[PDB]
Design an enzyme around this catalytic site. Structure first.
Site, PDB file in Angstrom:
ATOM      1  N   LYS A 183       0.812  -1.219   0.000  1.00 49.84           N
ATOM      2  CA  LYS A 183       0.000   0.000   0.000  1.00 49.84           C
ATOM      3  C   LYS A 183       0.852   1.279   0.000  1.00 49.84           C
ATOM      4  O   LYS A 183       0.469   2.281  -0.608  1.00 49.84           O
ATOM      5  CB  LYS A 183      -0.963   0.003   1.195  1.00 49.84           C
ATOM      6  CG  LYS A 183      -2.024  -1.094   1.161  1.00 49.84           C
ATOM      7  CD  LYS A 183      -3.144  -0.776   0.180  1.00 49.84           C
ATOM      8  CE  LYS A 183      -4.235  -1.836   0.202  1.00 49.84           C
ATOM      9  NZ  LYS A 183      -5.494  -1.369  -0.453  1.00 49.84           N
ATOM     10  N   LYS A 200      -2.708 -10.972  -7.113  1.00 54.36           N
ATOM     11  CA  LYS A 200      -3.984 -11.057  -6.388  1.00 54.36           C
ATOM     12  C   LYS A 200      -5.050 -10.129  -6.989  1.00 54.36           C
ATOM     13  O   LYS A 200      -4.737  -9.014  -7.403  1.00 54.36           O
ATOM     14  CB  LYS A 200      -3.720 -10.696  -4.917  1.00 54.36           C
ATOM     15  CG  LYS A 200      -4.922 -10.395  -4.036  1.00 54.36           C
ATOM     16  CD  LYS A 200      -4.470  -9.681  -2.770  1.00 54.36           C
ATOM     17  CE  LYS A 200      -5.632  -9.293  -1.873  1.00 54.36           C
ATOM     18  NZ  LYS A 200      -6.500  -8.226  -2.451  1.00 54.36           N
ATOM     19  N   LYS A 242      -9.749  -5.114  -5.187  1.00 55.76           N
ATOM     20  CA  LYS A 242     -11.023  -4.381  -5.234  1.00 55.76           C
ATOM     21  C   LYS A 242     -10.862  -2.896  -5.604  1.00 55.76           C
ATOM     22  O   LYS A 242     -11.857  -2.171  -5.654  1.00 55.76           O
ATOM     23  CB  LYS A 242     -11.799  -4.537  -3.914  1.00 55.76           C
ATOM     24  CG  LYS A 242     -11.229  -3.801  -2.711  1.00 55.76           C
ATOM     25  CD  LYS A 242     -11.994  -4.151  -1.447  1.00 55.76           C
ATOM     26  CE  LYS A 242     -11.251  -3.698  -0.200  1.00 55.76           C
ATOM     27  NZ  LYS A 242     -11.248  -2.222  -0.018  1.00 55.76           N
TER      28      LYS A 242
HETATM   29  N1  LIG Z   1      -8.187 -11.639  -4.322  1.00 58.94           N
HETATM   30  C1  LIG Z   1      -8.714 -12.128  -3.178  1.00 58.94           C
HETATM   31  N2  LIG Z   1      -9.021 -13.445  -3.047  1.00 58.94           N
HETATM   32  C2  LIG Z   1      -9.544 -13.952  -1.908  1.00 58.94           C
HETATM   33  N3  LIG Z   1      -9.806 -13.193  -0.825  1.00 58.94           N
HETATM   34  C3  LIG Z   1      -9.549 -11.859  -0.825  1.00 58.94           C
HETATM   35  C4  LIG Z   1      -8.973 -11.235  -2.022  1.00 58.94           C
HETATM   36  N4  LIG Z   1      -8.822  -9.927  -1.741  1.00 58.94           N
HETATM   37  C5  LIG Z   1      -9.262  -9.733  -0.469  1.00 58.94           C
HETATM   38  N5  LIG Z   1      -9.683 -10.889   0.070  1.00 58.94           N
HETATM   39  C6  LIG Z   1     -10.254 -11.083   1.423  1.00 58.94           C
HETATM   40  O1  LIG Z   1     -11.465 -10.326   1.524  1.00 58.94           O
HETATM   41  C7  LIG Z   1     -11.653  -9.913   2.881  1.00 58.94           C
HETATM   42  C8  LIG Z   1     -11.946  -8.420   2.920  1.00 58.94           C
HETATM   43  O2  LIG Z   1     -10.851  -7.691   2.367  1.00 58.94           O
HETATM   44  P1  LIG Z   1     -10.737  -6.107   2.635  1.00 58.94           P
HETATM   45  O3  LIG Z   1      -9.543  -5.590   1.863  1.00 58.94           O
HETATM   46  O4  LIG Z   1     -12.098  -5.476   2.477  1.00 58.94           O
HETATM   47  O5  LIG Z   1     -10.430  -6.034   4.215  1.00 58.94           O
HETATM   48  C9  LIG Z   1      -9.304  -6.668   4.870  1.00 58.94           C
HETATM   49  O6  LIG Z   1      -8.369  -7.065   4.195  1.00 58.94           O
HETATM   50  C10 LIG Z   1      -9.300  -6.824   6.367  1.00 58.94           C
HETATM   51  N6  LIG Z   1      -8.111  -6.215   6.920  1.00 58.94           N
HETATM   52  C11 LIG Z   1     -10.542  -6.163   6.966  1.00 58.94           C
HETATM   53  C12 LIG Z   1     -10.589  -6.346   8.461  1.00 58.94           C
HETATM   54  C13 LIG Z   1     -10.484  -5.353   9.423  1.00 58.94           C
HETATM   55  N7  LIG Z   1     -10.566  -5.875  10.676  1.00 58.94           N
HETATM   56  C14 LIG Z   1     -10.734  -7.209  10.629  1.00 58.94           C
HETATM   57  C15 LIG Z   1     -10.864  -8.206  11.589  1.00 58.94           C
HETATM   58  C16 LIG Z   1     -11.016  -9.539  11.191  1.00 58.94           C
HETATM   59  C17 LIG Z   1     -11.031  -9.895   9.834  1.00 58.94           C
HETATM   60  C18 LIG Z   1     -10.900  -8.929   8.827  1.00 58.94           C
HETATM   61  C19 LIG Z   1     -10.755  -7.601   9.210  1.00 58.94           C
HETATM   62  C20 LIG Z   1     -10.386 -10.292   3.640  1.00 58.94           C
HETATM   63  O7  LIG Z   1     -10.645 -11.431   4.467  1.00 58.94           O
HETATM   64  C21 LIG Z   1      -9.365 -10.617   2.565  1.00 58.94           C
HETATM   65  O8  LIG Z   1      -8.441 -11.636   2.966  1.00 58.94           O
END
Ligand SMILES: Nc1ncnc2c1ncn2[C@@H]1O[C@H](COP(=O)(O)OC(=O)[C@@H](N)Cc2c[nH]c3ccccc23)[C@@H](O)[C@H]1O
Ligand SMILES: NC(=O)c1cccc2cn(-c3ccc([C@@H]4CCCNC4)cc3)nc12
Lengths: 323, 333
Positions: free
Chosen positions: B112, B194, B197
């Protein structure tokens, strides 16, 4: 009235702290809307015993009350009792550069110690603060809070007040007893350099009698910071307690040795500290009183803090909470 | 009481098939088996600079999308992160039991930072600590995430154990729940990267709220390989694109990769892409149909946020009370 924010660590005040900064500010509680925040969330950036931290928080509260901080005029509260500090702390992290924190004046340092200037910025900015009476070692921290405030304001409009440092100093110069060139500091390691506010008369006599003077022959009680630093400090301490001028004291000690000076300094200082200690112990041992002060203060702080945080949250664009 | 599930997703960018397969699919499947709590992490989202109107809308989009996926507010707690102050409170406290070196070493912070060189902020650095606080507030046993969050979750375990060793049984030590398939869905034109989003190249991504017709076109143009003859076989090193398509198909249909490989024997990438396009287009049509019913019903979304934040606060305040008592703060009156 202008809003003044002062952060107080829950960890031992000296006569320098009191006769300098604190006594000045006790007498300005009707001129300003003064806020005193006992910063227990900042304290934990250094690991310490839990039961001593709780005790120290209540010790600090009672001592500020003992010094004359009036909870009906000023707002005094414990930082952790107002969630908005941590809330704004996180929000402002997102508008603070990593670079700015690293440039403050290696990998085993805790993140709290790295990140506390942002929380400090939040502490100040929450209350639309106009003035902050920082010391020299926290001038850089205040400046970051001014930079954060202006940066946020430029993006979203005039959400925060840009705070200023409180420029005029106390009046009482109080130097270390065994090092009269260096200022008397609560964070000194050498205890014999300081007179703590809860020290008994026997302890005061002992420390003042050991205080360094000079080798003038005859000994002469005269003010001269360059040539007679030790004797000058003793004069400044005595003047600060009694309100007698330096030239008045010089006349009072004409033909007198340094032993007589030290005796009068000890007597004057302990005379001052007996009144403060009476008030301190009376307040400190009254659990119900201290609890009511903290509750009332937290309530006042929260009312103001919530107003600012709501505007911050609205500006950022967070969906407002459903109550 | 049941074991507790906690997970979150950011209301930033536009959630993808990656986000669904890695996280949201498991969230829906765990609802009866465990006590499930799901968060829209708006405080994490703002570590990348957001337009204020876009953030608000995206928060409500994300909420509606949870509901559309099958997250039931009668079964699970659904709330917005900024509505529960305890997250920021424990977030700060846990900074003091987290080392600087643990945060600087993070892959997500590095990725990032390289991407947003003009806004390498303290929030982005401190990201994992707030994430740990999110999890630890609810006495969480299981955390369903994609592979890319494994590092973050490992730190939250370290912080939990480190705090517990000093103060007693204050936190549960959480465990990852990463799926067998679809844990790291890859980009369609760059399958060694990867799926993001917030990709500048929209042709890399399958968006959950994207026109199904547009999605089918993107699946057709997904890069495969030069193998002669074309063969549908799993090989991440030499056949990244084909492997990623098999992975997406496995995760949607619930069929194993060996089963899919057998099914595509004597077939080429036309069959593979046709089957992937059919299954994904079907999924998104149904999902988006449910989405609009929820998303345009402001009274319902408002009620879910109200009840959810209430449920979460009850659990979160209990944990923070114990944390504050342990570290030695004077308890609030
Ligand atoms: N290309 C991909 N393939 C498979 N899985 C994926 C891909 N991109 C993203 N993910 C998964 O999606 C979830 C949400 O991602 P975010 O970036 O919104 O958001 C995140 O990456 C977290 N930090 C948000 C968060 C904040 N506090 C927490 C506490 C527990 C669990 C999660 C969270 C995630 O599980 C991420 O692993
Ligand atoms: N001094 C102030 O007027 C003040 C106002 C608002 C917030 C503040 C936070 N601090 C503060 C923060 C941290 C510290 C030290 C920093 C090093 C570790 N031990 C605690 C000392 C003071 N001081 C503040």
């Amino acid at each position: 009235k202008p809003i003044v924010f002062s952060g107080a660590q829950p960890s031992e005040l000296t006569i320098g702290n009191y006769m300098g900064a604190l006594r000045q500010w006790v007498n300005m509680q009707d001129d300003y809307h003064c806020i005193y925040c006992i910063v227990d969330q900042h304290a934990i950036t250094v690991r310490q015993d839990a039961q001593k931290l709780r005790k120290a928080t209540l010790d600090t509260l009672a001592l500020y009350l003992a010094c004359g901080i009036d909870p009906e005029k000023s707002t005094i509260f414990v930082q952790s009792h107002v969630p908005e500090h941590a809330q704004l702390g996180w929000a402002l992290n997102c508008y603070t550069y990593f670079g700015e924190l690293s440039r403050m004046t290696a990998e085993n340092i805790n993140a709290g110690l790295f990140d506390y200037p942002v929380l400090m910025a939040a502490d100040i900015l929450l209350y639309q603060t106009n003035l902050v009476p920082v010391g020299e070692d926290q001038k850089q921290h205040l400046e970051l809070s001014r930079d954060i405030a202006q940066r946020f304001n430029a993006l979203y409009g005039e959400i925060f007040k840009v705070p200023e440092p409180f420029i005029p100093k106390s009046g009482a110069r109080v130097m270390s007893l065994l090092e009269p060139t260096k200022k008397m500091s609560k964070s000194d390691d050498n205890r014999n350099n300081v007179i703590g506010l809860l020290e008994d008369p026997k302890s005061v006599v002992k420390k003042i009698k050991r205080a360094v003077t000079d080798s003038d022959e005859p000994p002469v009680v005269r003010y001269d910071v360059q040539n007679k630093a030790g004797v000058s400090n003793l004069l400044d301490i005595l003047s600060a307690v009694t309100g007698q001028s330096i030239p008045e004291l010089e006349k009072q000690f004409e033909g007198k040795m340094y032993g007589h000076l030290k005796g009068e300094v000890a007597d004057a200082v302990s005379g001052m500290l007996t009144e403060l200690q009476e008030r301190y112990h009376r307040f400190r041992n009254d659990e119900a009183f201290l609890q009511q002060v903290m509750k009332d203060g937290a309530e006042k702080a929260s009312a103001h803090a919530s107003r600012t945080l709501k505007a911050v949250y609205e500006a950022i664009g967070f969906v407002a909470k459903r109550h």
